[PDB]
Design a binder for this molecule. Structure first.
Ligand SMILES: [Zn+2]
Lengths: 61, 122, 313, 325
RNA sequence: AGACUCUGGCAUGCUAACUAGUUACGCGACCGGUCGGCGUAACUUCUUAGAGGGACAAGUGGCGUUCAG
């Protein structure tokens, strides 16, 4: 299963070298399910992602 | 970034302090009047001064500043300072006083005061 | 009797500083601005817009402070901050002559019904008489003004040709041609002066500035007559050609006066936004009365010309 | 329906309730909260700014100093009070309202001022905070014009006049239960609860006294007939020699003594809020302590931190290894 | 150090340029047009080199002890 995404907020920079962006992901499946994910590359607020696995949740706490 | 120069500041303060009446909020007008008031060599410096004046007046017309003295607010301040009411605040009809205080008064010859009301600590 | 917004005029980037209306044509109106551009407007008075720009008179290297039309709607004249006094042709949209003499900011420009009488008022502390062709008639220096010469107008009257010059030196100075003699000094102001406007009849002049008090003087007598208080600083002063009405542009709003009873007529302001509470509203710099007697032309700091029309009732 | 600053502050959306919605232009500009100003930027605009006549302002202040609230009031506070008085005089009869209030009735009890009565959660011998009770927690709840004042000093003067006023609720307020401070040296009352020195004689001598104001216009004070309150215990203690400089913390003895500025760094005075939407991603459950800056090494502390430590009498015995900052 | 000065970016505004250039007008060559062919009325767009302008955190919004920023 492939789920599409939104960007609610761009939080900060994670990763070793400062390559990964920590981003708040709203779902495009109508649900207000806000999962925080890590992205590689440039992401601005209002981007729409293609997540391969939606069950995953990135480094919270 | 960018920060204001001491010289620019001081000159601006002088210009405001002396000739507040001539200046306004229009930057260009303030520049030109500055050019016609003070002995300025550089254009850039003059511009800076004008900017500072403009900012200052934007700020000052809302409320008075900590730094300088305005030729209207000196008068206003004076008026506010040399104020006195019609009736003195110590000339009161009935003054509330402790029993101890009353006793003290009595032990000073002032038992024949009329305006005192000896209130008991209930 | 009420005043209502008929339309809005957009075309300038910098502040609209002076509007000049022509009596000959009630369809084309000229407006000077800070964006170094004087736009001739073609009026259409639609629901879409009140007027479309027709020609933009580019030529000046600084703010065009004062523009003035001619007796006939074929010649214009502008005075800009660069010290340039430029005679424009409104037919071609091109300059005809360039009047060079001032060192400082040329603030004001004066033009007669006779046409061959041009007076420029500059921060150079100098009054200059000009021909239409470009010849300087007389340079005024002998006790002209202690500070900047703010505004200069003539007397549109069949009587004595009288020029009125107000300055930043807190004095209104009255001059007469062919002799160039100081006729009347008018002392009674707090703060600098901005504008002077002479009655369409040619009997009275109104001066204002920083105090917010429009001081009315007589031309024939040299006498104080009226004092008209206001809220904020006075930017522009105006007379109606038919109604005997002194319209003064105050701070953010315009205040119309009836001199016959010293009564307020109406205050003119349009702002709905309460979100910008700590921000100051756009001031009204220019004010001009149209030849119709119903239409007002008001120039603002919002770089926007607003027109006002009379709705009786 | 005259709105005070508290109405917007508590987000009382009573724009549907009244039709005579009038306010001062000053009180709406004095608010520093962003959410209330955001609310101001959206709300259905039927409000109208009004400033009253100086004749009415003079008449409010005339008895405001007689009721003993004028020092506790603000300039803007008097403006709202005057607005209501002149608005009532405009529409309704002026003869309803009385000039000069009533003589206050003294009624003493043996209860301590610190007794948690009128605190909603606390309960003596059922008094519960429920998900139904939360909106109900206001005060003592019981036609055309009124007020939206949350400040008691406001409410006191309003109800002394006989002006029918209300709160965040729909219905009119009848009884007003609150505390005021009385100085036990000069006997001059202040409605300002925050202050610790009196406005009159300047000593640290203000003590809490409960008051009730009826809609009729009657006042009564409950003085404490409890010896624990007026006890001269930890009051005389020898004080250090006054030190000046940047670091010297003086013992705080007048309301207007100039302290040297000692603030805490922004790393230090950040409290952790768990209800932030982006909280979970932030590495640690709590916001880091400051240990690097000078404020930490000089032991600069918040005003709330070390509160009960001040309440202990200086002539006592601290533990053998502690020093009281 | 900053400040001072220069420099560069901008001007169809100005001052000029027989060692700069354009436009128009004549003559010529070529098929009503093309010509770094040649000859003085247009004055500066290009080129040049000067003066004067022009930007100062100017304005708006947000953040800020409501100030410095
Ligand atoms: Zn006291």
């Amino acid at each position: 299963p492939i789920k599409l995404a939104r960007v609610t907020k761009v939080l900060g920079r994670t990763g070793s070298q400062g390559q990964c962006t920590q981003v708040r992901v709203e779902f495009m499946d109508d649900t207000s399910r806000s999962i925080i994910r890590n992205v590689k590359g440039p992401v601005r607020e209002g981007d729409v992602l293609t997540l391969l696995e939606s069950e995953r949740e990135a480094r919270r706490l | 970034g960018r920060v204001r120069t001491k010289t620019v500041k001081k000159a601006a303060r002088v210009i405001i302090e002396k000739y507040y009446t001539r200046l306004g909020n229009d930057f260009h007008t303030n520049k030109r009047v500055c050019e016609e008031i003070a002995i300025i060599p550089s254009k850039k410096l003059r511009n800076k001064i004008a900017g500072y004046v403009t900012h200052l007046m934007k700020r000052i017309q809302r409320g008075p500043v900590r730094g300088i003295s305005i030729k209207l607010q000196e008068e206003e301040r004076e008026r506010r300072d040399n104020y006195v009411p019609e009736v003195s605040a110590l000339d009161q009809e009935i003054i509330e006083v402790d029993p101890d205080t009353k006793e003290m008064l009595k032990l000073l010859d002032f038992g024949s005061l009329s305006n005192l009301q000896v209130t008991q600590p209930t | 009797e009420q005043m209502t917004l008929r339309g809005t005029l957009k075309g300038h980037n910098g502040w609209v500083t002076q509007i000049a209306t022509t009596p000959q044509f009630p369809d084309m109106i000229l407006s000077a601005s800070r964006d170094k551009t004087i736009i001739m407007w073609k009026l259409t008075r639609d629901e879409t817009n009140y007027g479309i720009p027709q020609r933009a008179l580019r030529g000046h290297s600084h703010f065009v402070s004062d523009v003035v039309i001619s007796s006939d709607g074929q010649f214009a004249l502008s005075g800009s901050w660069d010290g340039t006094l430029r005679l424009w042709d409104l037919t071609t949209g091109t300059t005809t002559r360039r009047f060079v003499g001032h060192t400082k900011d040329v603030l004001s420009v004066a033009f007669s019904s006779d046409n061959r009488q041009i007076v420029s008022g500059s921060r150079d502390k100098t009054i200059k008489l000009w021909n239409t062709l470009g010849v300087c008639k007389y340079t005024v220096q002998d006790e002209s003004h202690s500070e900047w010469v703010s505004c200069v107008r003539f007397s549109p009257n069949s009587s004595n040709p009288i020029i009125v010059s107000c300055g930043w030196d807190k004095l209104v100075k009255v001059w007469n041609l062919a002799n160039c003699k100081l006729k009347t000094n008018h002392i009674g102001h707090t703060g600098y002066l901005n504008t002077v406007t002479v009655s369409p009849d040619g009997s009275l002049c109104a001066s204002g500035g920083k105090d917010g008090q429009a001081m009315l003087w007589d031309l024939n007598e040299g006498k104080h007559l009226y004092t008209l208080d206001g809220g904020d600083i006075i930017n522009a002063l105006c007379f109606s050609p038919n109604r005997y009405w002194l319209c003064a542009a105050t701070g953010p709003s315009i205040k119309i006066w009836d001199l016959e009873g010293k009564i307020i007529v109406d205050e003119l302001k349009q702002e709905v936004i309460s979100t910008s509470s700590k921000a100051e509203p756009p001031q009204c710099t220019s004010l001009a009365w149209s030849a119709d007697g119903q239409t007002l032309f008001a120039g603002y700091t919002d770089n926007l010309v607003r027109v006002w029309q009379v709705t009786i009732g | 329906v005259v709105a005070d600053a508290g109405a917007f502050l508590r987000h009382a959306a009573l724009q549907d309730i009244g039709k005579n919605i009038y306010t001062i232009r000053e009180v709406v500009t004095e608010i520093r909260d962003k959410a209330t100003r955001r609310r101001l930027a959206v709300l259905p605009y039927e409000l109208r700014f009004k400033e009253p006549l100086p004749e009415y302002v003079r008449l409010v202040t005339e008895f405001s100093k007689k009721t003993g609230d004028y020092p506790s009031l603000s300039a803007t506070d008097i403006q709202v009070l005057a607005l209501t008085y002149q608005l009532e005089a405009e529409f309704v009869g002026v003869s309803h309202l009385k000039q000069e209030p009533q003589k206050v009735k003294v009624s003493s009890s043996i209860q301590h001022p610190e007794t948690p009565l009128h605190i909603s959660g606390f309960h003596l011998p059922g008094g519960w905070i429920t998900p139904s009770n939360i909106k109900q927690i206001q005060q003592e709840l019981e036609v055309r014009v009124g007020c939206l004042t949350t400040d008691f000093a406001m409410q006191n003067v309003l109800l002394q006049m006989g002006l029918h006023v209300l709160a965040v609720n729909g219905m009119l307020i009848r009884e007003a239960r609150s505390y005021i401070l009385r100085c036990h040296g000069c006997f001059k009352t202040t409605s300002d609860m925050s202050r610790v020195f009196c406005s009159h004689c300047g000593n640290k001598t203000l003590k809490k006294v409960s008051v009730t104001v009826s809609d009729d216009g009657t006042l009564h004070m409950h003085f404490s007939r409890n010896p624990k309150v007026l006890n001269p215990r930890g009051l005389r203690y020898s004080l250090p020699t006054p030190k000046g400089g940047k670091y010297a913390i003086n013992p705080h003895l007048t309301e207007d003594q100039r302290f040297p500025q000692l603030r805490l760094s922004q790393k230090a005075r950040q409290k952790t809020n768990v209800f932030a939407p982006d909280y979970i991603a932030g590495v640690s459950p709590f916001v880091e302590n400051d240990i690097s800056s000078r404020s930490a090494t000089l032991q600069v502390r918040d005003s709330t931190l070390g509160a009960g430590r001040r309440r202990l009498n200086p002539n006592a015995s601290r533990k053998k290894f502690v020093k009281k900052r």
